[PDB]
Every structure is written in structure tokens, then in C-alpha cells.
Amino acid sequence: MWLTKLVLNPASRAARRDLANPYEMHRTLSKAVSRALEEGRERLLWRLEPARGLEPPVVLVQTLTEPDWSVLDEGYAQVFPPKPFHPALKPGQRLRFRLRANPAKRLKTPAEKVAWLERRLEEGGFRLLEGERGPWVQILQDTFLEQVQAVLFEGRLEVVDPERALATLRRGVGPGKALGLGLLSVAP
Known part of the structure; x- marks a missing residue:
């Protein structure tokens, strides 16, 4: 990339x-x-x-x-x-992440948004870290693009499967990839 x-x-x-x-x-x-x-x-x-x-x-x-x-x-x-x-990704590697996405398949809601994120990450070879108060993630912004829902997630995750994880970084997460959504950014 x-x-x-x-x-x-x-x-x-x-x-x-x-x-x-x-x-x-x-x-x-x-x-x-x-x-x-x-x-x-x-x-x-x-x-x-x-x-x-x-x-x-x-x-x-x-x-x-x-x-x-x-x-x-x-x-x-x-x-x-x-x-x-x-x-260079490895099993168990912990990373901070940022992802602005559209919480759906195609183009408790706050809890449903986190739930959607969990599934997408797991399917993509990643896993949200667990803190003393649940999933290590916070919604920094919840708005609409001009109306397409745009949710900015930020938190910590771990690599489960390196190959699927890499493919996910290259592919993007969720719809609206042509609208500035879907870019999963990670960093130690």
C-alpha cells in the first residue's frame, strides 16, 4: 500500500x-x-x-x-x-486504530454501532481489545455525509489472523468507500 x-x-x-x-x-x-x-x-x-x-x-x-x-x-x-x-502483522499484536465508517451492510444504536464494528473487525481478522468497561472503543463523531451515516471509531484492537488482517487494511471496512469511509488506520 x-x-x-x-x-x-x-x-x-x-x-x-x-x-x-x-x-x-x-x-x-x-x-x-x-x-x-x-x-x-x-x-x-x-x-x-x-x-x-x-x-x-x-x-x-x-x-x-x-x-x-x-x-x-x-x-x-x-x-x-x-x-x-x-x-508486519503478527498474532496478538496490539494496535491503536481509527475508522470512519457507515455502520451497515450496504449504503440501542450507539451499542449497535459498536456491535457492527466488532463483527466487521472479527470477520476481517482483527479483534477489539477488552477493557474493564467493555470493548476498547469510543465513538468520537456520529454524523451524516451529504444522508449517509458516518461514524468515527477510535480504540485499540489486536491482530488475530495476519493475512486476513492485511487484506482488510487493503480492502477497507464497510460501504461508502468512495465517500471517505472505510479506511481502517492502525498504529502501535
Whole structure:
């Protein structure tokens, strides 16, 4: 995989348009890997990170092939050097995670949302860690994309099956992958 951190510049009208319409943002990001997507060798996943005041928004982008960000308009965003991402996963390995997702199969609710997450992670080869107060996860944001439900999960998990876990990172979790949902980000 390849991970690219983009710091969008709100001085750019196009950047603001994309920040306000996930569909448009996906269209712009797709340009960096258009041929790969055309040949079915790509799975573009991204996440508009939680906002910090009025500061420039950060968008984390994950692709299977090397992206060409020169396709972006000048001033659209500050492009940080894309980094190869090939995680070394092992059984029992504990990792912190972040995932903005649409809690459903296709495009107590708070407890149902966590329940949905548990099943998706287990099916994907991961497992939510258990704390003294239940599943190690919290809903940082519960909102709608323009209405598609978007839930931001953050917590701790462990790798159960390395191969399935890796496939899950490459594949994404849940629907709305073309709307900035589904990117499972992990870190020690």
C-alpha cells in the first residue's frame, strides 16, 4: 500500500468544494491513480481527519499503487511524500486504530454501532481489545455525509489472523468507500 498525507489549502476554491462534497473529493483523488482504477488494480480509500479549529484540513489517502499527485492543481494542497505501507502483522499484536465508517451492510444504536464494528473487525481478522468497561472503543463523531451515516471509531484492537488482517487494511471496512469511509488506520 501507499499512504499520502495531504494538507488541503482552503485558499483553493476547488479544495473547499471537495471538502464539502465527498463525491467530488473522491473524483479528484482518483486522478492520481486513474489508470490503476481503470485496470482494476486499485482500491482508493481516504479519510478527512478530525478538524482542529480553523487550521488546514488533513486528508490521509491510501492506495495500492504509487499515486501521481502532480495531477493536483497548484495550491490545491501541500503534498507530503507518499510512503510505502507494508505492515508486519503478527498474532496478538496490539494496535491503536481509527475508522470512519457507515455502520451497515450496504449504503440501542450507539451499542449497535459498536456491535457492527466488532463483527466487521472479527470477520476481517482483527479483534477489539477488552477493557474493564467493555470493548476498547469510543465513538468520537456520529454524523451524516451529504444522508449517509458516518461514524468515527477510535480504540485499540489486536491482530488475530495476519493475512486476513492485511487484506482488510487493503480492502477497507464497510460501504461508502468512495465517500471517505472505510479506511481502517492502525498504529502501535
